[PDB]
Amino acid sequence: SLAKERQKKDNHNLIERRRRFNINDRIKELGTLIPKSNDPDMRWNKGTILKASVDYIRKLQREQQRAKELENRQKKLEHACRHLLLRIQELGIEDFLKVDLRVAKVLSAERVEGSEKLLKLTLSLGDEERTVVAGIAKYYTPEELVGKKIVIVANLKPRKIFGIESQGMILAASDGENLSVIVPDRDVKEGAKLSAALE
Amino acid sequence: SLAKERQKKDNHNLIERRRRFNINDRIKELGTLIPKSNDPDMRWNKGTILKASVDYIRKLQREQQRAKELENRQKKLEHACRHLLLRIQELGIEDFLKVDLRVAKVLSAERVEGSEKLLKLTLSLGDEERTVVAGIAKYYTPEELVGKKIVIVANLKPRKIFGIESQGMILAASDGENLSVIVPDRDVKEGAKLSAALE
DNA sequence: GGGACACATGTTACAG
DNA sequence: TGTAACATGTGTCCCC
Known about the structure:
The structure is a homodimer. By secondary structure, chain A is of the alpha+beta class. Chain A contains five helices and nine strands; from the N terminus they run ααααβββαββββββ.
């Protein structure tokens, strides 16, 4: 029974060589996130890299109560600014036409893997077609707006989002724990230009 | 020499045994801080606690930088509204505009059990209510103060004493022989913001 | 020469 | 069973 021990040992070896390389490479990542906090006076070993990760987390847990009070405060200041701006009416109509608000008919509603926030969807502006990413996952289901037409912003530059190119942006009114999209009352031909000036 | 051979080993073994104990006891301590894994049936092996803490820090770093941006924005608002209300820009008046002195109204005052000289006030600023503690019980009765409009420092950091949170503190002046609160001369609406009188 | 490291085996749990 | 996850003890390397 010697030919088996030659392979039973070679199997156990690369089991641990995978486990060793796994943990020791995961500690290396931790070393990149911790702050230096000092000059080259202490050598970064696993003993200290871990101790630093613990000490780093506890400090971050201490700042948690401060941020909770800021998010509460911003909900109150956003409500004030929302009402304050209501009495500043100085938009030049030339500066409004710079923005091209357009009606778009939805074609795809591809959810995005590993993401409970963003939804990928292919829109159609008539002749032109675009793909836009929308952070509306937790509220709007994908197979809900397929075929129905919505209002977006067109004159934008294509920017990669979550590894996806999104040339455009979707309008949405929010109320915190719930948000809606913008939708034409009566059906119109998609790709239509929104215009405030009366003709 | 076979003793010196073992003595070199028995020491070498103990030095390493103390090293692994340290970097394993950190992973244990690192596990006490990682939150629940959304699965009440989960195996917490080291390779995952390291992976977990890495991801848990990458997430806390984003949340930290977010509040870092928010407090900057909120600080910018206070700066704008502060320079708004003071049209005649004066350099020497600075260091005092930072103080938000306002006229409040004592809705209800009650003595605090266990304190000889403390008083729990319930101030109204018109817009909102406030609970402020002041140490003037040895001089003012709770029956006197009700309805009396007092000037208070309405933007002091909330300091908790006697388990009650004093949101700002009232103004008082004492000559040593006596003590009085600071009121406005003519009757003005609650929540009126004091300012320097000059032209 | 002592502290940190990676590597090859002995032990336990009880997977898949 | 035979992995998968934790354990110990020994040899190479480092410092400059």
